[PDB]
Structure 1
């Protein structure tokens, strides 16, 4: 699922799955 174009909710979901209990930051403007 990581090695492709990941946009919008699809990107969020990938971050959620990979990062697990660490959580993550989603900063589309930066």
Structure 2
């Protein structure tokens, strides 16, 4: 859905900064 799609864009950028070298997994829905 658009609002959540746009929100998820900002989430991954935040994950990138928080997680650093550890990396992260992004699974919006499993």
Per the normalisation by structure 2, the TM-score is: 0.67
* Alpha carbons 1:16, 1:23 under 8 Å: kept: yes
Higher strand proportion: 2
Instruction: Extract unaligned runs of 5+ from structure 2.
Output: none
Instruction: Extract unaligned runs of 5+ from structure 1.
Output: none
Report the number of matched residues: 30
RMSD of equivalent CA atoms: 5.6
Per the normalisation by structure 1, the TM-score is: 0.67
